[PDB]
From Swiss-Prot, chains A, B:
Outcome (variant: residue 187 to M): In WD(a) antigen
Mutagenesis / variant outcome for changing residue 477 to L: In Di(a)/Memphis-II antigen
Stated name of the protein: Band 3 anion transport protein
Localization per Swiss-Prot or TrEMBL: Cell membrane; Basolateral cell membrane
Membrane topology annotation: Multi-pass membrane protein
Organism this protein belongs to: Homo sapiens (Human)
UniProt GO cellular component terms: ankyrin-1 complex; basolateral plasma membrane; blood microparticle; cortical cytoskeleton; cytoplasmic side of plasma membrane; extracellular exosome; membrane; plasma membrane
Keywords recorded for this protein, A-Z: Acetylation, Anion exchange, Blood group antigen, Cell membrane, Disease variant, Elliptocytosis, Glycoprotein, Hereditary hemolytic anemia, Ion transport, Lipoprotein, Membrane, Palmitate, Phosphoprotein, Transmembrane, Transmembrane helix, Transport
Means of activity regulation: Phenyl isothiocyanate inhibits anion transport in vitro.
Effect of residue 62 to W: In ELO antigen
Subunit field text: A dimer in solution, but in its membrane environment, it exists primarily as a mixture of dimers and tetramers and spans the membrane asymmetrically. Component of the ankyrin-1 complex in the erythrocyte, composed of ANK1, RHCE, RHAG, SLC4A1, EPB42, GYPA, GYPB and AQP1. Interacts with STOM; this interaction positively regulates SLC4A1 activity. Interacts with GYPA; a GYPA monomer is bound at each end of the SLC4A1 dimer forming a heterotetramer. Three SLC4A1 dimers (Band 3-I, Band 3-II and Band 3-III) participates in the ankyrin-1 complex.
Effect in UniProt of substituting residue 118 to M: In SPH4; Coimbra; also in AR-dRTA
Curated annotation (Swiss-Prot), chains C, D:
UniProt subcellular location: Cell membrane
Posttranslational mods: The major O-linked glycan are NeuAc-alpha-(2-3)-Gal-beta-(1-3)-[NeuAc-alpha-(2-6)]-GalNAcOH (about 78 %) and NeuAc-alpha-(2-3)-Gal-beta-(1-3)-GalNAcOH (17 %). Minor O-glycans (5 %) include NeuAc-alpha-(2-3)-Gal-beta-(1-3)-[NeuAc-alpha-(2-6)]-GalNAcOH NeuAc-alpha-(2-8)-NeuAc-alpha-(2-3)-Gal-beta-(1-3)-GalNAcOH. About 1% of all O-linked glycans carry blood group A, B and H determinants.
Effect upon mutating residue 7 to P: In ENEP/HAG antigen
One annotated GO molecular function: identical protein binding
Keywords: Blood group antigen, Cell membrane, Glycoprotein, Host cell receptor for virus entry, Host-virus interaction, Membrane, Phosphoprotein, Receptor, Sialic acid, Signal, Transmembrane, Transmembrane helix
Entire-sequence positions represented here: 78 to 117 of 150
Complex formation: Homodimer. Component of the ankyrin-1 complex in the erythrocyte, composed of ANK1, RHCE, RHAG, SLC4A1, EPB42, GYPA, GYPB and AQP1. Interacts with SLC4A1; a GYPA monomer is bound at each end of the SLC4A1 dimer forming a heterotetramer.
Identification of the protein by name: Glycophorin-A
Lineage of origin: Eukaryota, Metazoa, Chordata, Craniata, Vertebrata
Keyword Lipid metabolism tagged: no
Regions crossing the membrane: 15-37
Family to which this protein belongs: Belongs to the glycophorin A family.
The organism's place on the tree of life at top rank: Eukaryota
Amino acid sequence: PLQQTGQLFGGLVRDIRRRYPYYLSDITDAFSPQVLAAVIFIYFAALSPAITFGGLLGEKTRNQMGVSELLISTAVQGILFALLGAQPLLVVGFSGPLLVFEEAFFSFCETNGLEYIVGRVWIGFWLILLVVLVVAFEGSFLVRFISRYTQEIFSFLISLIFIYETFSKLIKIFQDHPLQKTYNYNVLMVPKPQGPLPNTALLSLVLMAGTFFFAMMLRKFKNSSYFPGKLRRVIGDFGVPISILIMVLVDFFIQDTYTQKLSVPDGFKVSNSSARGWVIHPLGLRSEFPIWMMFASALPALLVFILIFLESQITTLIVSKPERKMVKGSGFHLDLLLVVGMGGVAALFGMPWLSATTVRSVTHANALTVMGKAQIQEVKEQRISGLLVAVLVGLSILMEPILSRIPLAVLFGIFLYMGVTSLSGIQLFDRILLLFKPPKYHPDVPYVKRVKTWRMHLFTGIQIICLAVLWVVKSTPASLALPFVLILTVPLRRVLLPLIFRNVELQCLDADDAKAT
Amino acid sequence: PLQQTGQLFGGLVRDIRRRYPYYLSDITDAFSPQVLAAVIFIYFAALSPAITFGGLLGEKTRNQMGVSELLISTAVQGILFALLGAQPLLVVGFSGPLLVFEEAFFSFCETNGLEYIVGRVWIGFWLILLVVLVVAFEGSFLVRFISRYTQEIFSFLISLIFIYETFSKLIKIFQDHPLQKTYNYNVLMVPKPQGPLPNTALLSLVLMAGTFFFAMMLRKFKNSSYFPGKLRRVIGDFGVPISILIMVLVDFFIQDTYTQKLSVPDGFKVSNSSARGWVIHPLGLRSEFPIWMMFASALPALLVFILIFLESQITTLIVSKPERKMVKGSGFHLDLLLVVGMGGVAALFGMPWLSATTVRSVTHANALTVMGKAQIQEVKEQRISGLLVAVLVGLSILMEPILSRIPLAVLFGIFLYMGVTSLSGIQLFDRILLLFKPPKYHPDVPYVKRVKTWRMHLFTGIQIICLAVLWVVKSTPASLALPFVLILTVPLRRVLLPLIFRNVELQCLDADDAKAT
Amino acid sequence: GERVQLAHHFSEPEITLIIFGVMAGVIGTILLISYGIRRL
Amino acid sequence: GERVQLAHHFSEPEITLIIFGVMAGVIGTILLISYGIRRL
Ligand SMILES: CCCCCCCC(=O)OC[C@H](COP(=O)(O)O[C@@H]1[C@H](O)[C@H](O)[C@@H](OP(=O)(O)O)[C@H](OP(=O)(O)O)[C@H]1O)OC(=O)CCCCCCC
Ligand SMILES: CCCCCCCC(=O)OC[C@H](COP(=O)(O)O[C@@H]1[C@H](O)[C@H](O)[C@@H](OP(=O)(O)O)[C@H](OP(=O)(O)O)[C@H]1O)OC(=O)CCCCCCC
Ligand SMILES: CC(C)CCC[C@@H](C)[C@H]1CC[C@H]2[C@@H]3CC=C4C[C@@H](O)CC[C@]4(C)[C@H]3CC[C@]12C
Ligand SMILES: CC(C)CCC[C@@H](C)[C@H]1CC[C@H]2[C@@H]3CC=C4C[C@@H](O)CC[C@]4(C)[C@H]3CC[C@]12C
Ligand SMILES: CC(C)CCC[C@@H](C)[C@H]1CC[C@H]2[C@@H]3CC=C4C[C@@H](O)CC[C@]4(C)[C@H]3CC[C@]12C
Ligand SMILES: CC(C)CCC[C@@H](C)[C@H]1CC[C@H]2[C@@H]3CC=C4C[C@@H](O)CC[C@]4(C)[C@H]3CC[C@]12C
Ligand SMILES: *[C@@H]1O[C@H](CO)[C@@H](O)[C@H](O)[C@H]1NC(C)=O
Ligand SMILES: *[C@@H]1O[C@H](CO)[C@@H](O)[C@H](O)[C@H]1NC(C)=O
């Protein structure tokens, strides 16, 4: 699918012919309870980050873009991607680097006295031009140069970031309500508690730990030998919904203690009615838009395109590995085109652009993965799951009474479960574990029986330095340069690694399909 | 060892000749860090129940017998049993049925206006007469009629009781400090908090869960393939001390929140200086002791002898199974003689009599068990561990600053770990788990491949009814009749079971050494 | 829109149609140039 | 002992020695009876 045809829009046409014949199967393959369980999982797994990022965006942009706009954009883009995409298992939503770019662009517009939302409109206008040129010239064929090295480094780094943020949210909850001998029993609760409250942080920790424990125990029960096999697999598929329901009920039966809940806007309205409407004029809302900024928007549009391209294409590489039993094909050109086009269109309506997030899409693929008698058997590849997730995200405003009783701590345990389960398929994580094992306990794999132990440990340690460098870049104001540093690993793999490792060693350690050279 | 020689004190002499030749090995075999880790484990595992039972006894007997007397009796009896016993792995300490008997005897003495401690002195005097007659006539040979049926039923019931009490203590902690919106910040703390306090119950639950989680993770790390084998086994042996230290430090760094700690008496003094001294006159302290109660003390002494005999002999049967790789021998006559004699002597000093408790002795045996490459390899059979445990129990008063900073919640997690680890060697627990498994997943064991699945499930369900009956008796005022109902299982095994099961089925299901008939 | 917005000569559909037409013209010019190259 | 205790004719060592002697006599009598039985 990554070959270069040489024909204008050749990759786009091939991706359409690859997947659209399977459209009838993409509806009938969802007739299983595992698909419904995956829908319930991904609904929360996409709604909670959407709510958090919308709140942060509203705080950092004076509510020009907020929770409601992000939710509506997520719903529309998810529906259109599920109906028309070539890899429907990808989950389309907001991400951290996008929030960093929004912060930087808002600061730039505030410094120069520019309208932030109109600048976003012009960037999205420049986004549509860039993606069509890439699709026309089959620019997505460059993804074939991203080997398992960069993919696994990026996946491990993103999982570590997800776990770190999940723990840091609990740390922030503990800081907001510290353990003290005395508390003020008269503290205002609207809109948020203005002072420390008893039993809050400890109950949040208990709920998070219980959610994680129940999720892990039900995941083990799926592979366990207990109960009849059909009922056992049915319970194991619904493990995350069962854990969420149990912990939500546990928190519900504790009336006196306060726990932070999910918050959604009252209705389908703009976050700031005094700032902008549903349609933003490209010529300017309050002041006339400068001519020079219309042409100067290409460079931020270039950065956005680079970020979205790297995120979506690496996520597609991860979810479409041959070892994951993907027997329906993926379209790199079509999915990128749809994502960037939907982002550019949503820019016109004052809505944030999205990208195929690694954690959510990997969790969606794993939730649809059927395990054989250990060995992956098949994947429930269908369009119904993503469409239903997007519909439920859009309807999240209308189901506020249901969402208002769901604590964030249960969602934190769910996030921790997703983070720990996203490391199963990464060989980098496995080789990191081999650093703490005797050589005789190493599994019978091509990169152990054909490569010396110290050579393999050195190869793993080289990736660890890359992980440390990527982590340092994230913790700096220049965090938008992360895609470039990630790309810089490809010259390391293709040039510097052969200077110190043999061809057979590199083939065993870095294999596209886990083969013995 | 259970054979009847026909010679007066024949069993006592054989037990002495069986073990005392191994006395030199019983000192040199303790030169290993696993023995020290077991000492640290059993020190807490015997001190905390001792403190709790001493407090309850002081509350229920107006401090005539309390924490200090129980601790001193435990130290003396443990030292003498480790120095002279035939099975030093047994842990000598107070138990629940003994507390129930003490409550009943205190009520009887209060009703009839009798001196409780002098009545205990006369009971202990009658205790010495009964045990010598049993040892002289080799009455301990009747233990051979207690098959794996009764042993496993008693062990499973006792483990369930231990887990139930461990959870009920946490429930009581939660009830004492419920989750409320408002609390009184000015509550007196001496001697105990007179009102609910914030963050108390939740932190206790967190500490207990963390202790249990760390203990289980370190136990898995012992069998894991990580780290060098020597360091891995060293860490795994010290798993309980490491977990206790970690959780104690975690609670120590939380200054503001209150957690209940270990409480020991200030010094080696009687609990009630106005009631009795160190030596209690058998003729009476305040009033002259009646003549009729001197002869009438035999029946309560008979009940105490029955309780102690059943507890100690069944515990010895459990810890000395051939499948546990006990290659040094056990003496049923000598250990019972020593225990009952020490109880009778300690009765004269106003100290409680003890018995070989099942949970503590099983945990002590498991902590000294060395696992081969799954399969039990050997057991660190030595006298140093029990002697050091008794010495540390006696010195617990002198190390109050160390014990005053140890929360009970960590000890609750330790108790839960002991309860869950005491079920490994019971075939009744395994067959209960087989009730929730398909027949094809049953392990290759003689009672599965030679017995029909429904026959095995019926045999397991018969034991479940016995467990329910024993549980009902415990929850009634007639809880002292539990040994008789436990004995009644032996006629069920030897008479009623052959009427519905074949000889081969009973040999496969009830095997003394897990053999295929 | 919302509140008071500055009045422009072209409305939002008109300006977005003009921008899309300019973008389509640029894309067509680029495609024609690419078609011209790799042949002569 | 402690506080004020009723005075008895026999002190604690004396009474415990008497009780142990009575117990030893009873044990010896029982052992002699058992030795006599199973022989005639
Ligand atoms: C509440 C459930 C109903 C209670 C009523 C109790 C009555 C009751 O439930 O018996 C019916 C059924 C017996 O039928 P059976 O043992 O043949 O069922 C097998 C079982 O489902 C295995 O899990 C399957 O293997 P796998 O997993 O696909 O690999 C196997 O298929 P196969 O691969 O060999 O071809 C099945 O044949 O139960 C059980 O499954 C035993 C566990 C019962 C445990 C007790 C149930 C908790
Ligand atoms: C902090 C420790 C020192 C750090 C310095 C780091 C330097 C360093 O520690 O290497 C020395 C040593 C290598 O020596 P080596 O691999 O031969 O040691 C084997 C290892 O101890 C196994 O556990 C043993 O098997 P088992 O358990 O008895 O069944 C085996 O004995 P055998 O049965 O085959 O005859 C031993 O041969 O380390 C390791 O053990 C590998 C794991 C290192 C993991 C990293 C250490 C955390
Ligand atoms: C990349 C896409 C957006 C096309 C490239 C943008 C450039 C070439 C075009 C697209 C739309 C154009 C604008 C459309 C309408 C007007 C109003 C007119 O009174 C002054 C020029 C002005 C303001 C144009 C300037 C140039 C412009 C910004
Ligand atoms: C650095 C920390 C995290 C892990 C430490 C483990 C690494 C450094 C150790 C553990 C086992 C070691 C290897 C064990 C055996 C040999 C064979 C010898 O002829 C050359 C060195 C070599 C190949 C060792 C290299 C270093 C090694 C791989
Ligand atoms: C089972 C053991 C304790 C022996 C059996 C107890 C009976 C037989 C003996 C042992 C000690 C005896 C007591 C010892 C001393 C005295 C003081 C005397 O002025 C009156 C009788 C009296 C009170 C005795 C009564 C009988 C007695 C209680
Ligand atoms: C009661 C709960 C806890 C567990 C329920 C499982 C028990 C009752 C079920 C599960 C598997 C069942 C067995 C499966 C197959 C057969 C073979 C058939 O020819 C006779 C019945 C027999 C032998 C069944 C007896 C009942 C059985 C043992
Ligand atoms: C909406 O934007 C205006 C500036 O145009 C700002 O003053 C106001 O605070 C914003 N509303 C909210 C709720 O932040
Ligand atoms: C000691 O015993 C006396 C009765 O002899 C009783 O009044 C007193 O309360 C007891 N002491 C304690 C601390 O309970």
